[PDB]
Amino acid sequence: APRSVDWREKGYVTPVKNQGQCGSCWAFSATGALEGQMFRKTGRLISLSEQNLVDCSGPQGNEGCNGGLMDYAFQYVQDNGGLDSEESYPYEATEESCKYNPKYSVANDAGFVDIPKQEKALMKAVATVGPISVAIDAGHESFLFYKEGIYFEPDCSSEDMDHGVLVVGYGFESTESDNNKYWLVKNSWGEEWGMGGYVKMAKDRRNHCGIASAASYPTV
Amino acid sequence: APRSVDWREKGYVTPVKNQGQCGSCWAFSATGALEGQMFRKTGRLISLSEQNLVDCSGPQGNEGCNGGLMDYAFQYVQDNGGLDSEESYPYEATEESCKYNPKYSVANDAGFVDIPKQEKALMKAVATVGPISVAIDAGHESFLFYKEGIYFEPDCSSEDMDHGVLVVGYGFESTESDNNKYWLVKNSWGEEWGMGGYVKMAKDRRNHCGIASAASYPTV
Amino acid sequence: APRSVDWREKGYVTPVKNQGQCGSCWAFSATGALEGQMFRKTGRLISLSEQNLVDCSGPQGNEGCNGGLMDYAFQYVQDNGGLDSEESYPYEATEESCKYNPKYSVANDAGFVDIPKQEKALMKAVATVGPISVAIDAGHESFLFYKEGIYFEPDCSSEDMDHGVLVVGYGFESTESDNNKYWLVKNSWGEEWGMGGYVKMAKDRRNHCGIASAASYPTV
Amino acid sequence: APRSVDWREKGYVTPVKNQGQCGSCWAFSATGALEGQMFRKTGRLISLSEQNLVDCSGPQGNEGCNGGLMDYAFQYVQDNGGLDSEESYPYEATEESCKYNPKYSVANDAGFVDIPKQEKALMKAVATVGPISVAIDAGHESFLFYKEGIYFEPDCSSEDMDHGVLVVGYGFESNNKYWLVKNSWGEEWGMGGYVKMAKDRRNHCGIASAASYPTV
Ligand SMILES: *[C@H](CS(=O)(=O)c1ccccc1)[C@H](CCc1ccccc1)NC(=O)[C@H](Cc1ccccc1)NC(=O)N1CCN(C)CC1
Ligand SMILES: *[C@H](CS(=O)(=O)c1ccccc1)[C@H](CCc1ccccc1)NC(=O)[C@H](Cc1ccccc1)NC(=O)N1CCN(C)CC1
Ligand SMILES: *[C@H](CS(=O)(=O)c1ccccc1)[C@H](CCc1ccccc1)NC(=O)[C@H](Cc1ccccc1)NC(=O)N1CCN(C)CC1
Ligand SMILES: *[C@H](CS(=O)(=O)c1ccccc1)[C@H](CCc1ccccc1)NC(=O)[C@H](Cc1ccccc1)NC(=O)N1CCN(C)CC1
Structure with missing residues (x-):
């Protein structure tokens, strides 16, 4: 695998979004x-509807603003035969009845891939697949307050996320250092948080923080 | 809860045993x-005597090679004040008169805990307690020839185990059908069955197969 | 197409063979x-010589134990006007000079058909033609160690086979609505690999794994 | 010696591990x-760091994912004064700079013992010492494909391993005696990895030609 990867430079990544006061992080990870x-398969980047997922993927196990799983969202897209664009089905930050319209579907999948629980496997997937959905232990105020640098939290759990x-790449401190390697992670808390939202x-x-413990992506 | 658990890696689990042609599975579940x-308490892993349970726990309700319940076994160990080591009271795969000797007792318990009949509760117990005794519907040919992968039997019953x-953990792996999650279960049919007996x-x-329907563990 | 196909039951498929430590998989795919x-044409199943292909189809672009293409093998049979039987020209697992003898030829073809690169087209071809030559990404340890069930490898590539x-059929496991679907594939690593070599x-x-990316069959 | 031995039943053996796509088998043999x-000496079974060996035992002659010797690994632990736990220094399946931390050492040795190149000597060692590091000729597809039974490969070499x-025991049919061997290719391979x-x-396969264990 290359020593560093940034899928933003290849056109795979939409701008940073903001889930608001709704526990819909799973939907933003999934649309990412x-x-x-979809960009890998079609050459077109089209922002996708988190609201569609929040409102409609209950049958696959998701619970709207009360939480969910990226794999359940990938299952919804398969079962449903599509997913509407962000533009067609904009984000409201609260759960509503499903308003999916197939005429505005712009994405599809045939299931999903769970990556084995190894950071080496996650690296290979990031290098060869594209952006990867992951779950992390973000339940520490150091994460809430993060502004810049390599995030390390001594009390982070590797198992309870x-x-x-969304992992969009990875990098290093210098070509010869094992120290302070990093995953480049897109959050969904707006671009004020962190490093432009990253x-x-x-x-x-x-x-x-368990970044390799629940890594997955849709089959397209 | 954690997305993956394996108590074998923490030293909690003895090697796979073989009940032979005796219906004493309940005793192997209980000793497991x-x-x-006991390991959680003392830091010592000591193989325990299934034969002691087969021969001696009739008063609690067990019926030797003709079946029994793990909770009855836990009750016996408490009522009896002890349980002999596997080395001291080896397994003969046939019921005989009770030969318990307190001098060779290496385990005790103070009762047991029954887990609510939901997989969500079983997962919390596995994650926080250790290996959990469970009952399954294993009366299908597919269970005999199992070699690898996630076992799923469409004719399996959730009420008639x-x-x-013994559930020693849980985890996931990518599959064709995207039903990726599994309980890691220790059987008592020897190493040649399944994946090294798992x-x-x-x-x-x-x-x-009813895996969450009769789950319990002893209190030590 | 039918819901399931197994050309072995119709007499189209020879026993599993073993290429040994020679990179001649392409020749075994082509003979299969x-x-x-040839069975479809004549009603007689006759095992064909991989060694004939390894030794003789260089002019069409094949490179013996260093790799080849099934389409180049079909081109050789057409150019050459024949291919010898396995019995007459047995397999040696190493490249040698060409000893094709037309007296022992038992097959011919008039070219080949490349199937469109998707699985609906591949299924139609398997259902209407017979066994189909395919290439897969087999470059993972999971493939070496495969025992039973439906092979799914998260790191499998659809481009780098x-x-x-040889695809000899397809079908499904479990309940049909689970979409637990598979291709039935003959390998050439002997019957000790996999499920009797399948x-x-x-x-x-x-x-x-790219099973539809390089699928073809010969025209007889 | 006893007719059969299985050190797993005595608590000497950690679960099966997976070296991945790195030629670090020597390090898994050594930690095994x-x-x-260490269990024989202390009664504690603690998983040990193959990565520590891969990254750090170059001066003893090892070459990370490009190969090594169990004896060189045992020499490193002695020279270094310790070896970190698996938990503190987990496996990355690629060679990197040495990150050994003495505060997390959980093992030590005082050298190693090479066993004479005879199966009778290997049996005596297994019976009286515990699990034994060995090297074998595993360069045959029959070994890659192994699932069950007594492995025998007519093309195996007794000299080129x-x-x-790791030999964790031995047994008998009741002819076809066997060594019980723990591999490091994960649990899917073979019989739960054995x-x-x-x-x-x-x-x-040369199983007695390069057998040794650490002195603790
Ligand atoms: C989003 C995370 S968050 O809201 O942005 C947040 C806030 C502060 C600190 C850290 C993170 C959601 C939060 C859901 C929630 C709502 C209300 C109260 C508590 C929590 N997180 C999830 O949805 C997680 C994501 C996840 C994915 C994969 C693996 C592990 C975690 N999942 C979750 O909470 N679930 C999952 C399943 N089920 C359908 C409901 C519970
Ligand atoms: C062990 C199961 S088994 O023998 O390994 C087996 C074999 C083949 C397929 C599936 C399982 C025993 C079998 C008892 C038996 C022997 C001979 C004829 C009929 C039955 N199973 C039990 O002991 C079960 C286990 C159990 C525990 C908890 C909840 C549900 C089941 N229990 C059991 O059979 N009994 C009968 C008598 N006893 C007082 C109460 C429960
Ligand atoms: C057989 C595959 S194998 O040897 O059985 C094997 C072993 C282990 C894991 C996976 C597979 C050959 C291997 C050729 C090879 C030899 C030595 C070093 C590297 C490779 N594979 C081929 O022959 C492939 C088959 C193929 C067909 C169509 C599309 C994609 C792949 N072709 C190949 O390798 N070629 C083709 C062209 N040219 C003539 C030589 C390179
Ligand atoms: C592990 C064996 S393996 O990788 O798991 C494997 C794979 C397939 C089939 C069989 C085995 C390593 C492999 C080293 C290697 C990597 C890349 C290319 C070639 C080789 N094997 C070793 O490390 C062996 C083990 C050994 C120990 C004792 C006696 C004999 C062999 N040793 C080795 O390769 N050395 C020795 C010393 N020197 C430092 C480098 C070469």
């Missing part, structure tokens, strides 16, 4: 991964 | 769970 | 497809 | 043997 795989985000998470430090 | 809880086994039972598929 | 089409094999490969997951 | 001897593994190798058949 499906935006990337609470926040779905965080560099510690990479190859014993699966820090 | 007690081995785990016939086999006591089976990955379908997890979060409507309580498949 | 030609064995099927390295191994020529593997069930993930079907209808967007061309998993 | 040191795990057994390429794979470090293989029964032919025992007392002219040093099949």
